[PDB]
Every structure is written in structure tokens, then in C-alpha cells.
Amino acid sequence: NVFQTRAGCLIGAEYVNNSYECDIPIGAGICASYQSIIAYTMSLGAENSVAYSNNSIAIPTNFTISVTTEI
């Protein structure tokens, strides 16, 4: 249960090959979360790929009215 990161040494948390969103930031791309306590590398986001070609286009057929808040 001893881990070595760029920031220093971590005691009490186990490294996991999985990836999630950062909850408790530690540093150097390493975050921690509770589920016991685990540590992992934060995931930037959901990967996506676009079907780009020389003569294809995508056109919307529906819309949505959205409301957002800003404090």
C-alpha cells in the first residue's frame, strides 16, 4: 500500500490501472478517490472520432432550447 509519485510518497492508498474523473487532486496527473481509498491517473474525457471525408456533410434536423446559470 506504498506508492511512489512525482510529488512524493503515498501511504495508505493503492494504485489502480483504471481511470476516472479527478476527485481529490494530488498532482502530476495523479488523483485520489474513495470507493477504501484508491489513487489513479485522471482521465481527460470521453474519446471520440469524427467521420471526415472529402464530400460528406452533417446537418441537424432538430433543436433544443437550453437554460444555463452563471453566478
Partner 1 sequence: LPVSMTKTSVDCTMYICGDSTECSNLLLQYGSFCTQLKRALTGIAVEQDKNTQEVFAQVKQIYKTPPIKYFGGFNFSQILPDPSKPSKRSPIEDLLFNKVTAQKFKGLTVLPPLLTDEMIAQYTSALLAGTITSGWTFGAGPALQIPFPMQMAYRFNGIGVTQNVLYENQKLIANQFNSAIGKIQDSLSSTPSALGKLQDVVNHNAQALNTLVKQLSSKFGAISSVLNDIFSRLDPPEAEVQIDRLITGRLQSLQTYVTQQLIRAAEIRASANLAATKMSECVLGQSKRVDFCGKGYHLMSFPQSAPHGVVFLH
Partner 2 sequence: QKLIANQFNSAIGKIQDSLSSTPSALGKLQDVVNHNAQALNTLVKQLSSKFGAISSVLNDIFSRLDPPEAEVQIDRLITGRLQSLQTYVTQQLIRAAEIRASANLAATKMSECVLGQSKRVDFCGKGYHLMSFPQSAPHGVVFLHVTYVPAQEKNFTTAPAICHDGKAHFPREGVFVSNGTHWFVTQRNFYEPQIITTDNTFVSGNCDVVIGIVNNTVYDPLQPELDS
Partner 3 sequence: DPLSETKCTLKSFTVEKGIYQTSNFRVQPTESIVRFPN
Ligand X SMILES: *[C@@H]1O[C@H](CO)[C@@H](O)[C@H](O)[C@H]1NC(C)=O
Are 27 and 6 contacting, i.e. CB atoms less than 8 angstroms apart?
Answer: yes
Q: By C-beta, is 36 or 54 nearer to partner 3?
A: 36
| Binding-site string for partner 2 from residue 7 to residue 46, where x marks contact by CB under 8 A and - marks none | ----------------------------------------
Taking CA atoms, 28 is separated from 20, 23, 51, in Å, by 15, 14, 34
Look at residues 8, 5, 2, 1 and name the one whose alpha carbon lies nearest to residue 41.
5
Contacts to partner 3 from residues 6-35, by CB under 8 A: 24-26, 32, 34
Stretch that binds partner 2, among 3-11, 18-26, 30-38, 52-60 (CB under 8 A): 52-60
